[PDB]
Design a protein around this ligand. Structure first.
Ligand SMILES: [Cl-]
Ligand SMILES: [Cl-]
Lengths: 206, 206
């Protein structure tokens, strides 16, 4: 499956060609899982995803340059304030660019397909985590399931903008922590549920 | 239709009661247009919307205090840099809180209803603008319509977070400018289309 640009320009200029190729291949792999039937649309979506990876890269490079300058020049509270300001500026750049991404995708993809792109950019952690949680506690109430999914989908919106795998898993981890705490406050004995789950996994040949 | 809090706490503490009442009434009016059939869900959604108005208010109050301090203490480039930093910090606060809002709404509302809330918070400018544009140029291509709608929906995502009516209309205005420029670059004679549209409006008794 050889990628070629379509109408959407690939933001390749001035970038290391091996990096560009790695991002395009990553992006192609996400698009493959959509099983699109319009080969031109598939190229366009590939480019849109790649360009978003590249722009995120640039945002984080900017942030890192500011933090490097702070490490070299500042200490104590002044240093922490400069790091805080760089992080706010990073989150601002994410805000300013976040909505254009599904806007652009929507020219080619429906809502379900756009969600599948989000999942592709975030290792499908939403459904892995949701399925595991309901496997662990099969009598969760519908409202508990709904809240758990809502938090995972929120986590995904942040994770898709994160810098790398480590930071993506940290974003999910925050909301997994929230889920854990939520269930314990709602009266579930998580030690007991988890122990019984492991027994069920063994009993079914997992 | 008297509002009463449900399970979601209204973020009322320390706020002027007339302001609280005004925001609750605004929020109730948005929810009324959803025509929900679960009266408890309607109260919860009312509270969620009101609480988002209140949090946006607080974000803008923070931003304004920083800009006031800059006006009182700084001039020239230093002043512009402090204003820039306050705006980045504001956009950061918007980013950090934006995704929780539809997450919370999703416990009560489907995707279509959530969009109707977004429209309610933004004076329905998306559909007014879209309908007017297709009325003005009825032979737009499907891809042009799609791009126009995508830009209006993007505009809405920013507008729903804006401070007031003036700033909401400015957010839409940016993307209306983009639409105007887009159509002229795609070969439409906007002077001619607009003139012929006005004739059609007159001919139909508008
Ligand atoms: Cl190419
Ligand atoms: Cl109340």
């Amino acid at each position: 499956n050889l990628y070629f640009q379509g109408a959407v320009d690939l933001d390749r200029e001035g970038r290391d060609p091996a990096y560009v190729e790695s991002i395009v291949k990553r992006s192609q792999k996400i698009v493959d899982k959509l099983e699109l039937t319009d080969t031109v649309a598939a190229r366009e979506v590939t480019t849109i995803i790649a360009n978003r990876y590249f722009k995120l890269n640039d945002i984080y490079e900017t942030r890192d340059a500011k933090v490097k300058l702070a490490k070299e020049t500042l200490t104590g509270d002044a240093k922490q304030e400069a790091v805080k300001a760089a992080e706010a500026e990073k989150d601002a750049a994410l805000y300013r660019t976040h909505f254009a991404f599904p806007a652009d995708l929507s020219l080619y993809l429906d809502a379900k397909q756009i969600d599948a792109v989000k999942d592709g950019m975030t290792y499908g952690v939403v459904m892995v985590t949701y399925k595991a949680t309901v496997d662990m506690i099969p009598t969760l109430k519908e409202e508990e399931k709904a809240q758990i999914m809502a938090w995972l989908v929120e986590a995904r919106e942040f994770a898709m903008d994160a810098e790398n795998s480590n930071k993506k898993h940290a974003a999910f981890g925050k909301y997994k922590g929230r889920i854990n705490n939520y269930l314990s406050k709602r009266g579930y004995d998580l030690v007991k549920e988890r122990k019984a789950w492991y027994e069920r996994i063994k009993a079914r040949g997992g």
